[PDB]
């Protein structure tokens, strides 16, 4: 009954005060950043200046380090994403969060961090965190619906009746390959 936006609203508000970073384990075809920005705007008035949706890439690791350091003492929450991309910096990040647990340092601070489910994520970060999977609804219909949704309304409307018909059949073909996987041998034979 709680969908996902209401779940994330509830679990951010009721728990995850500080020292408990909010983890997002994501599957291909999922965006955590849009949902957290909506929930962020209802609780506190955030123009995306107070709170930062920092994307982790090589070189910007030092900016994230300054942002998380600035966040604690100020009391504004820092959204990190694609955490998995730097396995070196996570052993460094674990060491920072350990320092801030004893320090404890404005209240109403948070650390949202989103990774792809992979081996070589540090144990310490996953353990302390509140973990939350937003898995997209599996099914032929739900997978054919996502195939259209993907293509920009403006692009396909313009295209002539012949080409949009053959696109519809191709979306179904793309859907029926993903939905076959589900059956083991009798289905594909290979993932």
């Amino acid at each position: 009954k709680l969908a996902f936006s209401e779940i994330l609203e509830s679990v951010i508000n009721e728990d995850s005060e500080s020292t408990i970073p909010i983890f997002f384990i994501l599957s291909p075809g999922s965006d955590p950043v849009k949902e957290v920005e909506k929930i962020a705007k209802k609780k506190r008035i955030e123009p995306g200046k107070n709170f930062f949706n920092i994307a982790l890439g090589q070189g910007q690791d030092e900016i994230a380090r300054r942002r998380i350091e600035e966040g604690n003492k100020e009391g504004h929450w820092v959204m990190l994403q694609n955490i998995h991309l730097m396995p070196t910096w996570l052993i460094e990040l674990e060491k920072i969060l350990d320092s801030y647990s004893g320090e404890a340092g404005n209240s109403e601070f948070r650390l949202f961090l989103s990774a792809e489910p992979s081996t070589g994520i540090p144990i310490g970060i996953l353990d302390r965190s509140i973990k939350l999977t937003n898995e997209p609804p599996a099914g032929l219909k739900a997978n054919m619906k996502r195939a259209w949704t993907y293509f920009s309304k403006e692009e396909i409307e313009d295209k002539d009746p012949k080409i949009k018909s053959i696109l519809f059949a191709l979306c179904f073909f793309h859907s029926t390959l993903i939905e076959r996987r589900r059956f083991g041998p009798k289905g594909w034979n290979m993932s």
Binding site: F183, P185, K186, G187, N189, M190
Partner: protein, 286 residues
């Protein structure tokens, strides 16, 4: 008060030492001497290769079982891989060391052992009168079933004066059961143990048809695996459907060979329905 892992092994040890495994071990020299080596056909060579692979498996399971049996009852250092065989035996998984030897089929340990004795029992009817081949071979129960299909083409390359290369194997599905006596008629070896998943072979019509709602696997009747020359050009036949056979239910890199079986429906229907033959399903009688 449930039986411990190390007791559950001692039980299976006693069931396998109450069965004459160390006797079931083949003696290469005795069987080779029974063969003249002048009239030695292809079949003879394939079996002799199979009993060697089997004799190498059957030695390995007896050795690893008498070693863990010795290590359980008697004083002996307990090896890391031996505890892994005990653990796997409690779960009723086939051990990793045993699985690596012989066939890749996925069965429970008690089923695996019962199947292994039917493998042995296919070779114990070879040992006695090797020159006379069993009328209906059981392609299901070999190590390389692929090596037996080369053998049947070899026999036809002796009879007919043309190249072994140019032969492919053709599979005629017969209305007869294992009752039939006419043993290895010219051009083919009769075969049993093919199990069609994804569709249903009708017996009376003699054609691939749609699967019965609840019945998941339709066991094929005796298959007169002919050898015959390839077509001159790249040809496509609507009547026949080119279903791949696989050693196991898994069907992943266990492709043996493509068979050809009659269909009144379009073949495209069946490739989409994932229709395939399989050797081992755990739907094999007795």
């Amino acid at each position: 008060i449930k039986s411990s892992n190390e007791m559950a092994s001692d039980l299976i040890k006693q069931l396998l030492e109450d069965s004459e495994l160390k006797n079931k071990i083949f003696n290469m020299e005795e069987i080779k001497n029974k063969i003249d080596a002048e009239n030695k056909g292809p079949y003879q060579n394939v079996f002799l290769q199979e009993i060697e692979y089997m004799n190498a498996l059957l030695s390995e399971i007896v050795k690893d079982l008498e070693e863990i049996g010795q290590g359980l009852s008697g004083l002996l250092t307990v090896s890391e891989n031996m505890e892994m065989i005990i653990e796997s035996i409690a779960l009723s998984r086939v051990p990793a060391s045993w699985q690596k030897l012989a066939y890749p089929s996925k069965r429970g340990l008690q089923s695996w052992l019962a199947n292994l004795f039917q493998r042995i029992e296919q070779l114990n009817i070879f040992r006695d009168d090797p020159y006379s081949i069993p009328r209906v071979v059981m392609i299901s129960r070999f190590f390389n079933p692929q090596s037996f299909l080369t053998a049947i083409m070899q026999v036809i390359s002796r009879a007919k004066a043309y190249e072994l290369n140019k032969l492919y194997i053709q599979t005629e599905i017969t209305k007869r059961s294992i009752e039939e006596i006419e043993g290895a008629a010219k051009e083919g070896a009769y075969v049993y143990g093919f199990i069609l998943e994804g569709a249903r072979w009708d017996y009376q019509l003699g054609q691939l048809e749609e699967s019965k709602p609840k019945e998941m696997f339709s066991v094929l009747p005796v298959t007169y695996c002919k050898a015959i020359p390839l077509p001159p050009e790249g040809k496509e036949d609507k009547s026949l459907y080119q279903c791949p056979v696989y050693k196991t239910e898994d069907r992943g890199n266990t492709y043996v060979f493509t068979a050809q079986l009659k269909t009144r429906f379009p073949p495209r229907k069946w490739i989409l329905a994932g229709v395939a033959i399989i050797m081992d399903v755990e739907g094999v009688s007795d």
